[PDB]
C-alpha cells in the first residue's frame, strides 16, 4: 500500500534569512497526509523547525516500473520496551514500496513494532554477489527449484464450498 513521495520544505523566511535553505527527503507512506506529517517529524527533530515555523514546498509522488526482481537492503531503527536498536534487513521484491511493505509486516510480526515506532535510515538496491543474508541470497542463484511448500491449501479452499464429497481428495505433489 506504501507509496513513494519526495517532499521539499523550508523555514519561513525572515529579515536575517532572505532565501533560507531547502531540504528534501524521500518518504514511504500510505498517503500524502501521513507523508507530510512524517517529513515535519524529521525536520523538526533534525533541523529544529516545527510545522509552525516553515512551509512544505512540494510533495511529489513517484510511480515505479516492475517486471524484474531486485534485492533491497533497508537500514532502520525501531523502539522496544527496553530501549532503541539498529537493524538491517534484506528482501526480494519488485519495487521499493513493496519491499517496504514486506519490511513493515515482518517487523509487526517478529518484533511487534508498529509504523510510528520505526525510522528508516537507508533503502538501497544490493547486487547479487553483494548480498549478506541467507533467506535472500538463496534465491539469487541460477536454477533454484523446490516442490510446492503448501499444496494442502488448494484442497482445503475447494472443500470450503464442496463441504460434502464421496471420497477424501488427494494432495497432488
Amino acid at each position: 500500500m506504501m507509496q513513494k513521495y519526495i517532499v521539499y520544505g523550508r523555514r519561513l523566511p525572515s529579515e536575517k534569512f532572505p532565501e533560507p535553505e531547502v531540504f528534501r527527503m524521500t518518504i514511504y507512506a500510505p498517503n500524502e497526509i501521513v507523508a507530510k506529517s512524517r517529513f515535519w517529524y524529521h525536520l523538526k527533530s533534525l533541523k529544529k523547525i516545527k510545522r509552525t515555523h516553515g512551509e512544505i514546498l512540494d510533495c511529489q509522488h513517484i510511480e515505479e516500473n516492475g517486471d524484474f526482481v531486485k534485492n533491497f537492503g533497508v537500514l532502520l531503527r525501531y523502539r522496544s520496551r527496553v530501549g532503541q536498536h539498529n537493524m538491517y534487513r534484506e528482501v526480494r521484491e519488485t519495487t521499493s514500496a513493496r519491499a517496504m511493505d514486506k519490511v513493515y509486516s515482518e517487523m509487526a510480526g517478529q518484533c511487534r513494532a508498529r509504523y510510528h515506532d520505526i525510522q528508516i535510515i537507508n533503502v538501497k538496491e544490493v547486487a547479487d554477489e553483494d548480498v549478506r543474508r541467507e533467506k535472500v541470497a538463496m534465491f539469487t542463484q541460477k536454477g533454484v527449484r523446490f516442490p510446492h511448500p503448501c499444496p494442502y491449501v488448494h484442497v482445503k479452499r475447494a472443500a470450503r464450498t464442496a463441504r460434502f464429497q464421496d471420497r477424501a481428495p488427494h494432495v497432488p505433489q
Binding site: Y8, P30, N31, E32, I33, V34, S37, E55, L57, D58, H116
Partner: protein, 214 residues
C-alpha cells in the same frame, strides 16, 4: 396587479443572468487548472518549484456526539454551528478560525473541498434560513430575493462565491442551514487521520468522505 408583471419581468432578467453566469463560470473553472499547470512547467524548466495558494475555505463535519462534552469545546462547536453528529458546514480560513478549530479537532474532520463537492452539497441538500425558518432551495427565485443586495442572484453565483471565498462569503455562508447528511463510515473514531483514525485534518480526502453522505 403590478405584482404579476413585476414578478415575471424580474424572473426573466434573473434567467438571462443565470445563463450568462453559468457559461462564464464554467470558463473560469476550466482555465485555472491550465494556469497552474503552465506555472509548474515554467518552474520545472528552471531549477524552481511552483508553490500554489493555500486553502481559503474548509468543509467541516462533526463526527462525535453530545454526551460528556467540555464547556470550551461545546462553545466552539456552537459558534461553528455544529450541533448534531453528522452535520457539516463551510468555513473561512484565517488564524482566528484555525486556532479555534485545532481545539476541537478530536470532534471534527475537515479539509478543503472541490467545486464538484460544493455543487453536490448545495443542489442535493440545499436549505435556507429565512426569518428563522428552514426553507428548501429548489429554484433561483429564492436566492435573488434574499441575496441580491450582495450581488448573488443564482445557484451558480452562490457556488462561485463559496468556492472563491469572495466579498460576501459571510452572508452567502450564513444563508445556508447546516447540511444534514447521512451517517458516516469510520475506521477509528478516537484516532487522528495521520494515525489511521478518522478525526482531524484529512486534506483532499474530505471529498471521498462526504460523497457517500451527500
Amino acid at each position: 396587479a403590478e405584482r404579476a408583471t413585476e414578478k415575471e419581468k424580474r424572473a426573466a432578467l434573473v434567467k438571462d443572468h443565470a445563463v450568462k453566469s453559468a457559461q462564464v463560470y464554467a470558463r473560469y473553472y476550466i482555465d485555472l487548472v491550465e494556469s497552474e499547470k503552465k506555472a509548474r512547467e515554467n518552474a520545472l524548466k528552471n531549477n524552481q518549484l511552483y508553490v500554489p495558494d493555500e486553502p481559503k475555505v474548509y468543509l467541516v463535519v462533526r463526527i462525535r456526539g453530545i454526551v460528556g462534552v467540555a464547556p470550551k469545546v461545546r462553545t466552539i462547536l456552537s459558534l461553528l454551528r455544529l450541533r448534531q453528529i453528522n452535520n457539516a458546514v463551510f468555513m473561512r480560513c484565517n488564524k482566528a478560525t484555525l486556532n479555534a478549530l485545532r481545539i476541537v479537532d478530536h470532534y471534527v474532520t475537515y479539509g478543503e473541498p472541490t467545486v464538484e463537492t460544493i455543487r453536490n452539497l448545495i443542489y442535493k441538500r440545499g436549505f435556507a434560513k429565512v426569518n428563522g425558518q428552514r426553507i428548501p432551495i429548489v429554484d433561483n427565485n429564492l436566492i435573488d430575493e434574499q441575496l441580491s443586495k450582495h450581488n448573488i442572484l443564482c445557484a451558480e453565483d452562490l457556488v462561485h462565491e463559496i468556492f472563491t471565498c469572495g466579498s460576501s462569503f459571510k452572508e452567502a455562508n450564513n444563508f445556508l442551514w447546516p447540511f444534514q447528511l447521512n451517517s458516516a463510515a469510520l475506521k477509528d473514531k478516537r484516532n487522528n487521520f495521520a494515525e489511521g483514525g478518522d478525526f482531524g485534518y484529512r486534506g483532499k480526502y474530505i471529498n471521498e468522505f462526504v460523497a457517500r453522505m451527500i
